[PDB]
Paper text:
Recognition of N-linked glycan at residue N276 (glycan276) at the periphery of the CD4-binding site (CD4bs) on the HIV-envelope trimer is a formidable challenge for many CD4bs-directed antibodies. The glycan at residue N276 (glycan276), in particular, has been found to restrict antibody access to the CD4bs, an important site of vulnerability targeted by many broadly neutralizing antibodies isolated from chronically HIV-infected patients. Cryo-electron microscopy (cryo-EM) structures of these two antibodies and 179NC75, a previously identified glycan276-dependent CD4bs antibody, in complex with HIV-envelope trimer reveal substantially different modes of glycan276 recognition. Despite these differences, binding of glycan276-dependent antibodies maintains a glycan276 conformation similar to that observed in the absence of glycan276-binding antibodies.
Neutralization assessment indicated VRC40.01 to neutralize most of the glycan276-bearing strains of the 208-isolate panel; to visualize how VRC40.01 interacts with glycan276, we determined a cryo-EM structure of Env trimer BG505 SOSIPv5.2 in complex with the antigen-binding fragment (Fab) of VRC40.01 and an Env base-binding RM19R Fab at 3.3 Å. The density for the constant domains of VRC40.01 in the BG505 SOSIPv5.2 complex tapered off quickly, and only the variable domains were modeled in the refined structure. Hereafter, except for figures illustrating both variable and constant domains of VRC40.01, we used the BG505 SOSIP.v5.2 complex to analyze VRC40.01-Env binding because its higher resolution provided greater definition of interactions. VRC40.01 bound an epitope overlapping the CD4bs and used both heavy and light chains to interact with glycan276. Heavy-chain interactions accounted for ~70% of the epitope. The VRC40.01 heavy chain bound at virtually the same location as the N-terminal domain of CD4 D1D2 and made extensive contact with the CD4-binding loop, the D loop, and the β23/V5/β24 region. All three CDRs of the heavy chain hydrogen-bonded with residues in the D loop, with Arg50 forming a salt bridge with Asp457 in the gp120 V5 loop. Glycan276 was recognized about equally by both heavy and light chains of VRC40.01, interacting with CDR H3 and CDR L1-L3. Specifically, the CDR H3 formed interactions with the two protein-proximal N-acetylglucosamines and some of the mannoses, while CDR L1-L3 formed contacts with protein-distal mannoses. The five-residue FR H3 insertion contacted C1, C4, and C5 regions of gp120, with interactions including a hydrogen bond between the backbone nitrogen of Trp72CHC and the amide oxygen of Gln428gp120 and a cation-π sandwich of Trp72CHC side chain between Arg72DHC and His105gp120.
Residue numbers in the entry:
A (entry chain E): 137 to 141, 150 to 185, 189
B (entry chain A): 31 to 141, 150 to 185, 189 to 309, 312 to 323, 323A, 324 to 397, 412 to 506
C (entry chain F): 190 to 242
D (entry chain B), E (entry chain G), F (entry chain I): 518 to 663
G (entry chain H): 2 to 52, 52A, 53 to 72, 72A, 72B, 72C, 72D, 72E, ...
H (entry chain L): 1 to 107
Write the structure that this text describes.
Amino acid sequence: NITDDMRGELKNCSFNMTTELRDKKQKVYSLFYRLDVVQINK
Amino acid sequence: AENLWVTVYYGVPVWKDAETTLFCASDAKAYETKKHNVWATHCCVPTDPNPQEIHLENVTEEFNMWKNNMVEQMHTDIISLWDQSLKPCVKLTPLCVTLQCTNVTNNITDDMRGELKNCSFNMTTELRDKKQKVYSLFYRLDVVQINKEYRLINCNTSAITQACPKVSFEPIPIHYCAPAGFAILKCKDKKFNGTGPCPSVSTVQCTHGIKPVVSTQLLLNGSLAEEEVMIRSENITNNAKNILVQFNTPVQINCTRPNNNTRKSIRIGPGQWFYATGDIIGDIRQAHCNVSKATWNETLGKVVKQLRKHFGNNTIIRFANSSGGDLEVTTHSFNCGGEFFYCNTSGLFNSTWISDSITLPCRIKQIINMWQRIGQAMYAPPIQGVIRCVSNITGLILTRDGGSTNSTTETFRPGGGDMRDNWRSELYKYKVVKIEPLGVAPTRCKRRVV
Amino acid sequence: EYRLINCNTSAITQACPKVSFEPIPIHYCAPAGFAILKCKDKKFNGTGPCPSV
Amino acid sequence: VFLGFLGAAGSTMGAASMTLTVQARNLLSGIVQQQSNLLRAPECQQHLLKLTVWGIKQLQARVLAVERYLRDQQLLGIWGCSGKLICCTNVPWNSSWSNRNLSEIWDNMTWLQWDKEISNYTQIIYGLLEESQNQQEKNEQDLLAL
Amino acid sequence: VFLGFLGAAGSTMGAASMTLTVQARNLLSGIVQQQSNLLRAPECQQHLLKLTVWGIKQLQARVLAVERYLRDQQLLGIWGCSGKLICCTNVPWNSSWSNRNLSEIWDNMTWLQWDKEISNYTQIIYGLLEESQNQQEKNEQDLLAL
Amino acid sequence: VFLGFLGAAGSTMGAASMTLTVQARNLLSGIVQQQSNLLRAPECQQHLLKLTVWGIKQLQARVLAVERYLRDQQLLGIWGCSGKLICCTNVPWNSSWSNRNLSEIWDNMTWLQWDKEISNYTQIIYGLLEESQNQQEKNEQDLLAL
Amino acid sequence: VQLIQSGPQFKTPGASVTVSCKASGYIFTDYLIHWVRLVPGKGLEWLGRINTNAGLMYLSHKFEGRLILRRVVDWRTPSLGTVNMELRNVRSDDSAIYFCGRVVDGFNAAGPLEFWGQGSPVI
Amino acid sequence: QVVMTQSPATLSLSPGETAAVSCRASQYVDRSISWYQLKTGRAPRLLVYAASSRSIGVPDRFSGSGSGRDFTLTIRGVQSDDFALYYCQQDYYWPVTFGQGTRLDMK
Ligand SMILES: *[C@@H]1O[C@H](CO)[C@@H](O[C@@H]2O[C@H](CO)[C@@H](O[C@@H]3O[C@H](CO[C@H]4O[C@H](CO[C@H]5O[C@H](CO)[C@@H](O)[C@H](O)[C@@H]5O)[C@@H](O)[C@H](O[C@H]5O[C@H](CO)[C@@H](O)[C@H](O)[C@@H]5O)[C@@H]4O)[C@@H](O)[C@H](O[C@H]4O[C@H](CO)[C@@H](O)[C@H](O)[C@@H]4O[C@H]4O[C@H](CO)[C@@H](O)[C@H](O)[C@@H]4O)[C@@H]3O)[C@H](O)[C@H]2NC(C)=O)[C@H](O)[C@H]1NC(C)=O
Ligand SMILES: *[C@@H]1O[C@H](CO)[C@@H](O[C@@H]2O[C@H](CO)[C@@H](O[C@@H]3O[C@H](CO[C@H]4O[C@H](CO)[C@@H](O)[C@H](O)[C@@H]4O)[C@@H](O)[C@H](O[C@H]4O[C@H](CO)[C@@H](O)[C@H](O)[C@@H]4O[C@H]4O[C@H](CO)[C@@H](O)[C@H](O)[C@@H]4O)[C@@H]3O)[C@H](O)[C@H]2NC(C)=O)[C@H](O)[C@H]1NC(C)=O
Ligand SMILES: *[C@@H]1O[C@H](CO)[C@@H](O[C@@H]2O[C@H](CO)[C@@H](O[C@@H]3O[C@H](CO)[C@@H](O)[C@H](O)[C@@H]3O)[C@H](O)[C@H]2NC(C)=O)[C@H](O)[C@H]1NC(C)=O
Ligand SMILES: *[C@@H]1O[C@H](CO)[C@@H](O[C@@H]2O[C@H](CO)[C@@H](O)[C@H](O)[C@H]2NC(C)=O)[C@H](O)[C@H]1NC(C)=O
Ligand SMILES: *[C@@H]1O[C@H](CO)[C@@H](O[C@@H]2O[C@H](CO)[C@@H](O)[C@H](O)[C@H]2NC(C)=O)[C@H](O)[C@H]1NC(C)=O
Ligand SMILES: *[C@@H]1O[C@H](CO)[C@@H](O[C@@H]2O[C@H](CO)[C@@H](O)[C@H](O)[C@H]2NC(C)=O)[C@H](O)[C@H]1NC(C)=O
Ligand SMILES: *[C@@H]1O[C@H](CO)[C@@H](O[C@@H]2O[C@H](CO)[C@@H](O)[C@H](O)[C@H]2NC(C)=O)[C@H](O)[C@H]1NC(C)=O
Ligand SMILES: *[C@@H]1O[C@H](CO)[C@@H](O[C@@H]2O[C@H](CO)[C@@H](O)[C@H](O)[C@H]2NC(C)=O)[C@H](O)[C@H]1NC(C)=O
Ligand SMILES: *[C@@H]1O[C@H](CO)[C@@H](O[C@@H]2O[C@H](CO)[C@@H](O)[C@H](O)[C@H]2NC(C)=O)[C@H](O)[C@H]1NC(C)=O
Ligand SMILES: *[C@@H]1O[C@H](CO)[C@@H](O[C@@H]2O[C@H](CO)[C@@H](O)[C@H](O)[C@H]2NC(C)=O)[C@H](O)[C@H]1NC(C)=O
Ligand SMILES: *[C@@H]1O[C@H](CO)[C@@H](O[C@@H]2O[C@H](CO)[C@@H](O)[C@H](O)[C@H]2NC(C)=O)[C@H](O)[C@H]1NC(C)=O
Ligand SMILES: *[C@@H]1O[C@H](CO)[C@@H](O[C@@H]2O[C@H](CO)[C@@H](O)[C@H](O)[C@H]2NC(C)=O)[C@H](O)[C@H]1NC(C)=O
Ligand SMILES: *[C@@H]1O[C@H](CO)[C@@H](O[C@@H]2O[C@H](CO)[C@@H](O)[C@H](O)[C@H]2NC(C)=O)[C@H](O)[C@H]1NC(C)=O
Ligand SMILES: *[C@@H]1O[C@H](CO)[C@@H](O[C@@H]2O[C@H](CO)[C@@H](O)[C@H](O)[C@H]2NC(C)=O)[C@H](O)[C@H]1NC(C)=O
Ligand SMILES: *[C@@H]1O[C@H](CO)[C@@H](O[C@@H]2O[C@H](CO)[C@@H](O)[C@H](O)[C@H]2NC(C)=O)[C@H](O)[C@H]1NC(C)=O
Ligand SMILES: *[C@@H]1O[C@H](CO)[C@@H](O)[C@H](O)[C@H]1NC(C)=O
Ligand SMILES: *[C@@H]1O[C@H](CO)[C@@H](O)[C@H](O)[C@H]1NC(C)=O
Ligand SMILES: *[C@@H]1O[C@H](CO)[C@@H](O)[C@H](O)[C@H]1NC(C)=O
Ligand SMILES: *[C@@H]1O[C@H](CO)[C@@H](O)[C@H](O)[C@H]1NC(C)=O
Ligand SMILES: *[C@@H]1O[C@H](CO)[C@@H](O)[C@H](O)[C@H]1NC(C)=O
Ligand SMILES: *[C@@H]1O[C@H](CO)[C@@H](O)[C@H](O)[C@H]1NC(C)=O
Ligand SMILES: *[C@@H]1O[C@H](CO)[C@@H](O)[C@H](O)[C@H]1NC(C)=O
């Protein structure tokens, strides 16, 4: 439900984050604004 | 109406109540060679050279031990010194990993079943491409079962630091001393209850030596009352306030941690070491404290005799044990020969007053939250050999339940409360005032103008 | 297979590339209320009653 | 030093006026102000540098003792009393500030009691003492004097 | 305190000489020097300890006010003026330093203007004032006087 | 300033008594106490804030110079010498403390030698000077005088 | 003075239920905190009380093996604190609205309650 | 335990009429009786601290009386706002106990 003026403004990013117990990993996600990220090499 | 003029005097012996910062000092004798003692390093200013005490004839002054800012200051400075001495230590972040644990069954008595866990895990190494398999014993109270898989308790909320193995938190006596321009007034009346118009006052340069001993329920190694057991409280009829009871004779308590215990160090990183508990040499039995039975009878008779003065001489006074949902509110917490003890005192507070020895079983812990913080935790390294402490019980912290029935009785239990109640038991006699040397008064002189 | 020497005992820091530890001369100066006395005798051996101060 | 520091506190104003050097000597010299002036280094000092918070608390205590001392000396200077522990002025007593005769206050009251009796007239009196000195200097700058 | 702190700044030297206590009283007492002397703890203090840089900046300001005050008092002492806001000396006026009559400077100039007129003779005058006092003490140590 | 700071040290007591302002002027003014009072910022200051240990060492040095100065001034005030570099008292010489005539000490000894001769009588003498001033004030509070 | 309770809960019989009451606006220590259970078909029942300074528990003699009270304080912030309740072996007999309340000033040795929370409820 | 009994189980009256609730202890309780006003969806309101002494914020419509074993809640000009449940609380022996409660109904 994005308006035209918001197309491409928000990115939905998932990643492998560290955890409180140091032998585990977790898959989490967060929204980011386009201006906060860099496309490299989705 | 006399023809008088204003005369100005400087050096007038007048003062006002005031808050300030005291600087602390110590007796640089045996304590001088302690070297790694925290208190011997901080309270560096030498004192007690046969210190002065000056009697003030005809001075009556108002004291209030419950509003005494010296206690709040002592509390804050103790906390700051603990944080400062732990701040530069190893920080055992790498230990919060899954542990693989089994029970220790090697010559354990019945009272130790399930008390010790033998845990192995994959630890980091000094060279950063390797891992090592190591193991350590842990006390049941330091671990959490998850999903034989365990984790250390303090994983959800904080990193756990490690006390530095050479730092000694031994409560050697310290003295509080006033800065220039201020003075400490001492109340000398015997049988002073903590408040009001004390008629016998003297000044001092510094306070008597106070040992910053930290405990719950039973106050250890403090001063004794001069004549009779003293009962002091902010308000004795309000069963919300604690009652501080000062004994006029010590009760000796002998605490020990049996089990020969060994220690090994493991590199967790490049000069970063963790101290593990190795196999116990000899058999495995519980820690405990011994209180003479006859003595812990005679001294309650004295406490009760004094309680009757406030509660009625036809009132039944009974003692009962602590009840609550935690360890920290039910046990007698203290540090002994460097290790932390949580002893069960229900064997002491069990009697009704109507007008050999007592063995207290005790548990110990290595991971201590300390004070009242949620984050911040410390790992106490194990100590090799066996531990024996001989201490004096100098007072009690008690609370009342509330009223009971029409039979007219009162129930007292070991209380809890803030650590500040331990300092209030020693600093109740002191007040800090600011000296104000200027003043004016009428005289018959007049400046002669020349 | 090799390792750096300082692995068993310590972390190794790195001098910051712009920091220059060049021994330019410095002078020690007394605080108010104090004074520095200098021994001027030539052939003074480090100890004793220096007559030229 | 400190051999009877507030010894006269419970005594009468008259008797207490004879011990004024006793309290004056203890305003600039606490224990730490004696240790700081040893010929040998005090040794402790490293502690107060390694842990700068303790270093700051100690300095604040020392600076304050000096500031309080100097402010009292400045007032005595302004009022025309440079030095002296006891000085006479030209400001008359109002008999409103306190209405007692000399034989009552010098013999029966202590300085603490006196201080609690006229404490809310302190600023009035200090203001008058300053005005008096200014008037005196205005009269001094007149070569015909009085 | 501070009710006309530089009020005489635009006035003549003569009139301004009558307000000297006004400026003297504000040399040792800034706001922070009043907060530091409360009977109650100031409360703020923890901030200056948690963050030691702010603690140091505050102390430097307080120490400097004291040092500047004491240096001026030391000069007055050396020149033979212990206390007093106005003191006479034995050093004659050179009429090179400034060449104006009394009726011109005391009535027409402000102190700021005067200060900008003789500022490069300040050290000469101070040197002479010190020599004068030394000569006076040499004469005092003669029991036949003058 | 500092043009002959200890120049009289090897001279006799008599001659050295004529240079007393020379040493007095250097008790409150070291180099850092001059840099701290520039109209311009000293620039260096950031160093002493970034590294708080150096900031503390500098303040300790400055505070101590002030405390030592004030303690000497307080003693002179207590003994009845407010100001003056040379003051006479009413305490007689004991001839036990030192037993030499005036023509021997003022002409043949230096102050350093004198200091090493009577150093263990210093506290006795200071105690007597204080008692003398207290006795004088007791006599002043008598309108029939002497 | 405000007492804020956690929301409604449902539990499998035999399970424990934990509820809480956050208190603010008065000194947390002093003023004992009491728990009362309301059963629409029976009336009010007292469960117990806690001494927030000492951390001591006093219970109605029905629940000694079932009910544990705890408190959390921080000496830093005297006006704030919490009281927690743990009730074990929950059964349909325990369907009730569980209330938090505070004793009338001057009545710590007794238990009239001047201030009240909202009621959990549980099952 | 000390049992409190309230009576009548119900009241039936109109606004402007007076009302009262009786409560009796199985044991002597001196003056340790407090009173509460209950409504659906609300925690109990404390009306009376002890025996006759009324709580803060309560209007003059309410007062109490009685001692020892025999206690009463008195309501004067009953408002439609007072058509609530009332409870008698025993606070002398521990546990704190409550009576069964009474109810004030509309005619
Ligand atoms: C130290 O701590 C103690 C606490 O331990 C503090 O004491 C407390 O002080 C407050 C006042 O600040 C008192 O509050 C008032 O209490 C009366 C009721 O008092 C009567 O009933 C008591 C019932 O107690 C029962 O339960 C206990 C506990 O199990 C049993 O032991 C008892 O036997 C009973 O079964 C009874 O205890 C009282 O007797 C005691 O006190 C009297 C002195 O008051 C002594 O002589 C006795 O010997 C005995 O020690 C007594 O019989 C209430 O009526 C008051 O409410 C009125 O006033 C309020 C003021 O704010 C007002 O808001 C209310 O609405 C109400 O107002 C009415 O009266 C006004 C009069 O002016 C009218 O104008 C108004 O219109 C209206 O009509 C109030 O709640 C506590 O009871 C007392 N607690 C205890 C345990 O004693 C002590 O102050 C602290 N000291 C210091 C220095 O801090
Ligand atoms: C209430 O008040 C009492 C009385 O003061 C107090 O009891 C005393 O507690 C202290 C601290 O625990 C005890 O001191 C320890 O004693 C042991 C035992 O030594 C005995 O044998 C030697 C001869 O070999 C005698 O000289 C000595 O007097 C005893 O009879 C010592 O081993 C301890 O020393 C080690 O720990 C110190 C920590 O501060 C170190 O500073 C010290 O250097 C030692 O550590 C080194 O060696 C260890 C062993 O190899 C090693 O593990 C370490 O890593 C390190 O290399 C220490 O001196 C004292 O004996 C108790 N007094 C009595 C009568 O029992 C209570 O504790 C107090 N209560 C409360 C609650 O505070
Ligand atoms: C905690 O668990 C560890 C294992 O993770 C225990 O250590 C192990 O003890 C066994 C003996 O019970 C050792 O096996 C024997 O080794 C000898 C050589 O020393 C060999 O001759 C025997 O035939 C047998 O193989 C085992 O090597 C040893 N493992 C490690 C890593 O040390 C430890 O004793 C347990 N501690 C407690 C208190 O339960
Ligand atoms: C989190 O890590 C896992 C691996 O532990 C990633 O899953 C693998 O990704 C590679 C490509 O880089 C594939 O070739 C493997 O087949 C994947 N394995 C599995 C089990 O799916 C996963 O993509 C990472 N997640 C995020 C969000 O980065
Ligand atoms: C240390 O790490 C090793 C793996 O590097 C663990 O061994 C494996 O454990 C998984 C189950 O989690 C098994 O499926 C593998 O077959 C095991 N591999 C081998 C070679 O044994 C080992 O358990 C970890 N040790 C500890 C104490 O946690
Ligand atoms: C300490 O003792 C004093 C008396 O020496 C108590 O103060 C008096 O208390 C009674 C009530 O019992 C009052 O009627 C008096 O007016 C009070 N006198 C003064 C001077 O305040 C004091 O309450 C006792 N303190 C404690 C904590 O019990
Ligand atoms: C506390 O008292 C008990 C006795 O009740 C002590 O235990 C005894 O110790 C001796 C010497 O090792 C043994 O011969 C006895 O058989 C033990 N008795 C029992 C019942 O175990 C214990 O050592 C004392 N604790 C402390 C710290 O002194
Ligand atoms: C605590 O330990 C001390 C030893 O340090 C015990 O005191 C000894 O008691 C025996 C009698 O059983 C005497 O013969 C010894 O002479 C005593 N020794 C000393 C140094 O006094 C004390 O009894 C123990 N306390 C408890 C409660 O068990
Ligand atoms: C306080 O003392 C009572 C005994 O008077 C202890 O009650 C026992 O608790 C255990 C569980 O911890 C039960 O298995 C026993 O059956 C209880 N005894 C009785 C007679 O019912 C109570 O645990 C003690 N409290 C603390 C904190 O130690
Ligand atoms: C504190 O100590 C008491 C006394 O030893 C413990 O109470 C006993 O517990 C055992 C079970 O281990 C029961 O068989 C006894 O009947 C209990 N004694 C009484 C008088 O009831 C108590 O359990 C200990 N507290 C804790 C928390 O473990
Ligand atoms: C508290 O005291 C009671 C006695 O007043 C202890 O109970 C007795 O224990 C002995 C065994 O040592 C039995 O022979 C008695 O029959 C018991 N009497 C009663 C009335 O129960 C009780 O164990 C003590 N509590 C604690 C924690 O030690
Ligand atoms: C327990 O209390 C006793 C009694 O005060 C302490 O023994 C005295 O210690 C003082 C020094 O503070 C000596 O002057 C006395 O001669 C000692 N009295 C006796 C009978 O020996 C004892 O040291 C205290 N124990 C602890 C661990 O602090
Ligand atoms: C404390 O008060 C007493 C009583 O007023 C003072 O006693 C006087 O002492 C002097 C000197 O010895 C005598 O000449 C007076 O006659 C005594 N007064 C009475 C009524 O007998 C005592 O001096 C006061 N304390 C101080 C330090 O001044
Ligand atoms: C600012 O300058 C004016 C003008 O020179 C000053 O005015 C004089 O005020 C006094 C007092 O009221 C009069 O007696 C003079 O006659 C006025 N001068 C003239 C030329 O009319 C004014 O006083 C100065 N401000 C200050 C603070 O001194
Ligand atoms: C250092 O010692 C010499 C020798 O005692 C002093 O010389 C005297 O100087 C004065 C002034 O020129 C002459 O009047 C004397 O006659 C000289 N003495 C002799 C014995 O010839 C010299 O002044 C001393 N230095 C200082 C700084 O005082
Ligand atoms: C996502 O953003 C890219 C530009 O980076 C755009 O070309 C693409 O069409 C966008 N996709 C959708 C579904 O909007
Ligand atoms: C180990 O501890 C558990 C409780 O956590 C117990 O059920 C089990 O029987 C114990 N095993 C041994 C060998 O003691
Ligand atoms: C927090 O602690 C609880 C036990 O009280 C545990 O079940 C939970 O998994 C822990 N949280 C995390 C993220 O591990
Ligand atoms: C403790 O004192 C009470 C006093 O009533 C007595 O009955 C009891 O036997 C005494 N206990 C011991 C061990 O002497
Ligand atoms: C002024 O001081 C007198 C001292 O007797 C005191 O009674 C009076 O209340 C004080 N005035 C004010 C406003 O506090
Ligand atoms: C000295 O002061 C006078 C003030 O009138 C000024 O004109 C002159 O330039 C100054 N001399 C120097 C070298 O600055
Ligand atoms: C006191 O001073 C004289 C100086 O001549 C010295 O000889 C003597 O030894 C000193 N006394 C002591 C106890 O040091």
